[PDB]
Amino acid sequence: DSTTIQQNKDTLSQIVVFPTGNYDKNEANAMVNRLANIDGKYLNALKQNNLKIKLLSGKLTDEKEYAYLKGVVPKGWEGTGKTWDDVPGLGGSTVALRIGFSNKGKGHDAINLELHATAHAIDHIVLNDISKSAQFKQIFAKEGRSLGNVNFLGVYPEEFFAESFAYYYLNQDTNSKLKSACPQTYSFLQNLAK
């Protein structure tokens, strides 16, 4: 409801960091609004852990903390001809996101960039790598190839977790698609949020 969405935006106000210089303020806002759909318990946990969601106006590797990834081919991106220099988002111990690259087809094939990235942070920092737990590995073994991109999502349980998470929280349509395609994963996320 309205109050809860606002609470989540308030939490995100203490998580999201905007870039210095010129950038698309309207699209940055849109990204925050999509992130506000994530269950508040995860957002509160991100805040408590001082996890920042860094929005960027340029390449990830032009940031001092990611310069070491220049020329490095990300996990699962083998054969793409792309390196981290070309990748618009990152999630894990940190989160970094290029403004304007949210949608599928903008340098990636995730249903939504910021939700996928933030899911990685929630997985790693908040949930202590639950995607690599025995419970999730069993679910992944059954349903991990039912959301497409099977050489990525079907291979890395942390990626299946992150994209399922994104389907669950992006909108009603994707939420429904996940339920139909991956019922055990859907139930798992549903219970995770209790």
């Binding site: 990834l69 990300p74 996990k75 699962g76 991106w77 793409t80 792309k82 981290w84 990748v87 618009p88 988002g89 990152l90 999630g91 894990g92 111990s93 940190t94 990636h108 094939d109 995730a110 960039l113 996928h116 990235a117 990685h120 790693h124 991109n149 990525f152 999502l153 942390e158 990626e159 992150a162 994209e163």
Partner: peptide, 7 residues
């Protein structure tokens, strides 16, 4: 730790 989006 670092993880990319879906290629």
């Amino acid at each position: 730790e670092v993880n990319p989006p879906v290629p």
